[PDB]
Amino acid sequence: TLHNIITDTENVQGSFSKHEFQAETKKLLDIVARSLYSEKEVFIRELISNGSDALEKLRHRMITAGGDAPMEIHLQTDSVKGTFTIQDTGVGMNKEDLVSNLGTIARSGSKAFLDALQNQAEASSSIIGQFGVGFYSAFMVADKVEVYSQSAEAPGYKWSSDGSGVFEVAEASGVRQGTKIVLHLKDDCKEFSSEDRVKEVVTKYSNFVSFPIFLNGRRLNTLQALWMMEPKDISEWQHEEFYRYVAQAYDKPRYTLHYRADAPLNIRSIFYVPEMKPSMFDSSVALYSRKILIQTKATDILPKWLRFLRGVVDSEDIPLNLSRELLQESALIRKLRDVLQQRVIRFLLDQSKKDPEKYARFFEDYGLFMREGIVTTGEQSVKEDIAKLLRFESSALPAGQQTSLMEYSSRMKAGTRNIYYLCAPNRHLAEHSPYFEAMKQKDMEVLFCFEQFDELTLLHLREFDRKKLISAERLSSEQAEDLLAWMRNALVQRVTNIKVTPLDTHPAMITVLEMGAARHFLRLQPTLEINTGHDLIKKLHALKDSNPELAQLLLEQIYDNAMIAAGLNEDPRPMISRLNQLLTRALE
């Protein structure tokens, strides 16, 4: 029932030829200029990266062979002629370098320059170019490209091409030191001769480029890359400002984490938690490399549950896809994500100590993210890492006070290893749980979990600290029996039981067996319990025969009042008209 035709039936017969791999130059240029980037606008990123690199090499040269000029990138638009022009005052290119570097695809002068530096040299970490293709991005948007270049050594040149397999080189006066590139834009790309549009692209990708960038004689990039600076030389106001820019936000960060490290990758990063809680009516952490935008929404570097963080991650040696808008599959990027997960958890844990009050607000607003993380990850070790961030209330603690799974594990009786919880809409329904009343008597402490999805979190948690979480789950004696028998008939299809109990000020209360049910209800088999010493109950007893119609309203009210006190009816609008009838008739 198997069908395979793969068989070792081949044998080397005779002699063989040796060939070198070739490359169809014509088609390859078309591929860069058409089939490489998701957006045409990206040619501006590339040309500015080149200007930065040229400037960086000049700066490097002058450390040793010092000499004389300012280091700048200038952009000019001409909306009448349809041109885009960029000029840098960097190292420039002689005729040999124009032909070699521009004329040859995947040849990178910058890459060779990098490979020859001491790894410690500043330029080692700021040179952007790697592949030797970014320049061809100009043909995506231009029918004609002209390059004027003057090297810093001992004649100016003009390089020229339409990008169709050929190019021309001639001597030129009077070219300024560095390189000037003029793009004659295609008709469908004339938008890049608009100043406003070019400004949008520069700020998107290249806002943190190290050298001043001018557009039509005006400076743009006034924003310094805070993530590359020493964490201590940065003030709270700089973070507030930088946060707003990077998160496109208008509030401040409640938390700031400035993380720098060298392994598995170079990392310079800043993470923020917004002060404003998120909701339905609605950026992410951005990825950079050597100060250039890679992805506005970084995908592989953080786990999904940490998507509430804003900010930036920059790595010098993260493996980039050729398009420079994706990362390659890498064991190093996987390790980075794991490292960051642990760092952020560690940071939030520290914060729960420094200010439990503040952390309490944070957990109310963002705790859902932690719960999601515990449910969706498949690593038990990490589930218990994220679980250190959870807060609940406890049977063994007062109302409104939070504790962690660790603090519970702390207080446990020495001879036991079970974590008991009870997921309830509220505390009243918890304290009066049949299942919890059990754990009151013989057993001891139970976690009260009121938040949404607290349940399946713990179900998915399964195991914490090698331990197991498991859900713990007046009126005479015949005047009352008469009253009860009456009550069961007026509330036939509302409750599945009516009891009598020792309540004080409250004439009745609602209790529920399954908390699980009550959630379906709020999305039920209540048990009303009557205080036969309460005046309204004794009044109810008297009116059931004397004024049956009045006692019907009163009964309904006592039931509704009990459901409200149990948090089982949060919006009492349905009762108001009846209640008003009860009041008018009572007040005759």
Ligand X SMILES: Nc1ncnc2c1ncn2[C@@H]1O[C@H](COP(=O)(O)OP(=O)(O)NP(=O)(O)O)[C@@H](O)[C@H]1O
Structure tokens at 7: 């068989």
Of 149-188, which residues contact its own copies (CB under 8 A)? Answer: 156, 158, 160-161, 165-176, 180
Is 93 annotated as a binding-site member? yes
Residue 42 C-beta: closest distance to ligand X, Å: 11
Is 464 annotated as a binding-site member? no
Which amino acid belongs to residue 58?
Answer: L
Strands (E), 230-282: 253-261, 267-274
Name every residue whose Cβ is closer than 8 Å to that of residue 196 and which is 6 or more positions away in sequence.
none
Residue (76 or 351) nearer to its own copies, CB: 76
With 0-12 CB in 10 A as exposed, 13-18 as middle and 19+ as buried, what is 329? Answer: exposed
Beta bridge partners of 509: 529
Is 207 annotated as a binding-site member? no
- From the list 134-142, 274-282, 509-517, 575-583, the region that binds Mg ion by CB under 5 A is 134-142
Is residue 326 involved in binding its own copies (CB under 8 A)?
yes
Residue (190 or 343) nearer to its own copies, CB: 190
**Main-chain phi, psi angles of 129, to 5 degrees:** -65, 140
**Main-chain phi, psi angles of 557, to 5 degrees:** -70, -40
Residue 469 C-beta: closest distance to its own copies, Å: 18
Residue 221 C-beta: closest distance to Mg ion, Å: 18
Residue ranges that bind ligand X, judged by CB under 6 A:
46, 49-51, 53-54, 88, 90-93, 101-102, 108-111, 129-135, 179
Structure tokens at 54: 């040229």
Residue (24 or 357) nearer to Mg ion, CB: 24
DSSP β-ladder status, 156-161 and 467-471: unpaired
Q: Site size for its own copies, by CB under 8 A?
A: 126
Is residue 561 involved in binding its own copies (CB under 8 A)?
yes
Is residue 50 involved in binding Mg ion (CB under 5 A)?
yes
Residue (129 or 373) nearer to Mg ion, CB: 129
Is residue 442 involved in binding its own copies (CB under 8 A)?
no
Q: Which does residue 141 touch among Mg ion, its own copies, ligand X, none (CB within 5 to 8 A, set by kind)?
A: none
Residue (71 or 247) nearer to Mg ion, CB: 71
Is 479 annotated as a binding-site member? no
Is 363 annotated as a binding-site member? no
Residue (277 or 417) nearer to its own copies, CB: 277
Residue (103 or 231) nearer to its own copies, CB: 103
Which amino acid belongs to residue 227?
Answer: W
Count of residues for the chain? Answer: 588
Q: Rounded distance, CA 26 to CA 100, Å?
A: 17
Q: Rounded distance, CA 459 to CA 101, Å?
A: 61
Q: Are 213 and 302 in contact (CB under 8 A)?
A: no
Q: Which residue has the tokens 């609008």?
A: 573
DSSP 356: H
Q: Are 565 and 509 in contact (CB under 8 A)?
A: yes
- From the list 8-16, 234-242, 386-394, 442-450, the region that binds its own copies by CB under 8 A is 8-16
Q: Rounded distance, CA 316 to CA 119, Å?
A: 12
Neighbours of 75 (CB within 10 A): 24
Is 136 annotated as a binding-site member? yes
Q: Which does residue 207 touch among Mg ion, ligand X, its own copies, none (CB within 5 to 8 A, set by kind)?
A: none
Q: Rounded distance, CA 257 to CA 271, Å?
A: 5
DSSP letters of 197-221?
A: HHHHHHHHHSTT-SS-EEETTEE--
Structure tokens at 313: 């991650």
Is residue 400 involved in binding its own copies (CB under 8 A)?
no
Binding-site string for its own copies from residue 476 to residue 515, where x marks contact by CB under 8 A and - marks none: -----------------------------xxx--------
Residue 179 C-beta: closest distance to ligand X, Å: 4
Is 324 annotated as a binding-site member? yes
Is residue 51 involved in binding Mg ion (CB under 5 A)?
no
Is 133 annotated as a binding-site member? yes
Residue 177 C-beta: closest distance to ligand X, Å: 11
Candidates 134, 156, 163, 178; binder of Mg ion (CB under 5 A) is 134
Q: Rounded distance, CA 569 to CA 492, Å?
A: 19
Beta bridge partners of 256: 272
Is 487 annotated as a binding-site member? no
Half-sphere exposure of 316 (CA within 13 A, CB side): 17
Residue (110 or 377) nearer to Mg ion, CB: 110
Residue (50 or 161) nearer to Mg ion, CB: 50
Is 59 annotated as a binding-site member? no
Q: Rounded distance, CA 306 to CA 343, Å?
A: 12
Q: Rounded distance, CA 510 to CA 528, Å?
A: 5
Residue (105 or 234) nearer to its own copies, CB: 105
Q: Which does residue 156 touch among ligand X, Mg ion, its own copies, none (CB within 5 to 8 A, set by kind)?
A: its own copies
DSSP SS3 for 207: coil
Residue 133 C-beta: closest distance to ligand X, Å: 4
Rg of the chain over CA atoms, in angstroms?
Answer: 36
Residue 109 C-beta: closest distance to ligand X, Å: 2
Is residue 6 involved in binding its own copies (CB under 8 A)?
yes
Q: Are 258 and 236 in contact (CB under 8 A)?
A: no
Which residues make up each annotated binding site for ATP?
46, 50, 88, 93, 101, 108-109, 130-135, 179, 324
Which residues make up each annotated binding site for Mg(2+)?
46, 50
Which residues make up each annotated binding site for ADP?
50, 88, 101, 108-110, 130-132, 135, 179
Which residues make up each annotated binding site for Ca(2+)?
101, 104, 107, 132, 136
